[PDB]
Amino acid sequence: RYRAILETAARLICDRGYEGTSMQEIAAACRMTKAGLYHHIQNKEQLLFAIMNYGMDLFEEQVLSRVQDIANPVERLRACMRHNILLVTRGWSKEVIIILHEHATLTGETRAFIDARKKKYVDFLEEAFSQASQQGLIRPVDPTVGAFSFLGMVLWIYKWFKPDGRLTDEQIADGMVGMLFPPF
Amino acid sequence: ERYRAILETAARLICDRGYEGTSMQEIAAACRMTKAGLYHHIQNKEQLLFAIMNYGMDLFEEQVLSRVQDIANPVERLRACMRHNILLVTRGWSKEVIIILHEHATLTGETRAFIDARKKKYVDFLEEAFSQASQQGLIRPVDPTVGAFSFLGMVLWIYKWFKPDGRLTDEQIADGMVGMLFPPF
DNA sequence: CCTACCGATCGGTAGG
DNA sequence: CCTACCGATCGGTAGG
Ligand SMILES: CC(C)CC(=O)SCCNC(=O)CCNC(=O)[C@H](O)C(C)(C)COP(=O)(O)OP(=O)(O)OC[C@H]1O[C@@H](n2cnc3c(N)ncnc32)[C@H](O)[C@@H]1OP(=O)(O)O
Ligand SMILES: CC(C)CC(=O)SCCNC(=O)CCNC(=O)[C@H](O)C(C)(C)COP(=O)(O)OP(=O)(O)OC[C@H]1O[C@@H](n2cnc3c(N)ncnc32)[C@H](O)[C@@H]1OP(=O)(O)O
Fold this sequence. Notes:
2 copies of one chain form a homodimer.
Chain A: H1 3-16, H2 23-29, H3 34-40, H4 44-67, H5 73-89, H6 94-101, H7 108-135, H8 143-155, H9 169-180
Helix pairs in contact in A: 1-4, 1-6, 4-5, 4-6, 4-7, 5-7, 5-9, 7-8
The structure holds Isovaleryl-coenzyme A (IVC) (2 copies).
Chain B binds a DNA duplex (16 and 16 nucleotides) through helix 3.
């Protein structure tokens, strides 16, 4: 019902962008009128905030929740990279791509709320890079450099990847994992 | 030149507020013109973005490829390219370059195929050095495409999180990113 | 949720 | 519901 609308607004806000998508063609896609759409959601800003929260929920469910209980820090980063890459490549959630593209669209309390959820993922990586680097499991590296190098590789995928391209998302994953986390 | 000054001003705005979110009225106000005087120098809004992106590529090719394309050692070329490409972003001087990174799917038709075709000249350049470096054993074997977009991922994503007033300098980010993907081997 | 509309603003163009 | 402009306004659309 409710999240069935975000499913529809996310598809449009993703193809045409937040500022480029209108509340008219969203409601027209949801089979309503501009007025009827405002009954379920407060306004266009709260619509994006909802989409970006529903995205972080799907992210934590299919990535962090699967790798947060791995003892070896480097083994935890490998699995995290492989799961994150498949989340972007498979295209299972367009709410996640909106979070990567509209990174500076929100403002105020809605901005600070999602930003605080994103930095929880950075601190997760900063910690794993600080553990591995100290246990001698990877070449020494500043935990921040590693975290955003990690994030840069996997999250920049949404700008160039296509499922019908040469390689598969599987091959790209194996290649990046071995490229950043090789046996040491 | 007056035309160039308009691309720079219109770039600083379109970077902050975005393309679809910037108005031709406030671009004109920024250029200290009337909205009609603005449309004398630029055809329309679509062509204003196109010109901003071409000017950004000219800058990129001047401040990056032009500085490293004559290096013989392939890994030493990937190290200097990363350095220069990282600084180009952390400096924030060329907001036209940032618009290229963010508004990647804003253009359409021939204007995008044009900018996308100049972009692809940069992945072919990286794929080569990543193919030469693997054959010459200067880096661990890797598919050239996976290496090019790992190079670009680390480097270009910087525009989404870097703040010049953080704890690390743009130099420290370069050293750590280089040493992490192109370590002595 | 619809029909009816609003304040304002959109990209673009008119005559001088 | 000729160059580089200008003051004013075109037809349509935005979020609400
Ligand atoms: C300021 C400066 C630094 C800016 C730049 O130059 S960065 C440009 C390169 N890096 C980017 O992140 C840009 C992302 N946006 C773009 O438009 C990219 O340039 C491209 C998507 C590659 C545009 O290339 P274009 O050929 O015009 O469009 P296509 O998608 O049809 O081309 C396909 C090419 O994309 C890549 N690709 C996409 N999917 C896969 C895949 N599954 N496996 C392997 N490679 C893949 C790949 O490079 C492919 O090229 P080919 O395989 O045909 O040689
Ligand atoms: C699948 C998907 C949903 C996964 C995610 O959640 S995305 C992971 C977030 N990574 C991104 O690149 C997204 C784009 N960037 C952002 O959204 C923001 O920068 C966030 C890091 C998430 C939030 O930043 P926030 O703390 O709210 O506000 P700030 O502007 O003060 O950011 C400061 C933090 O960014 C980093 N940073 C920025 N500049 C520097 C620097 N010069 N040296 C070292 N680190 C730096 C750094 O992590 C910093 O945090 P602190 O150093 O203060 O602890």
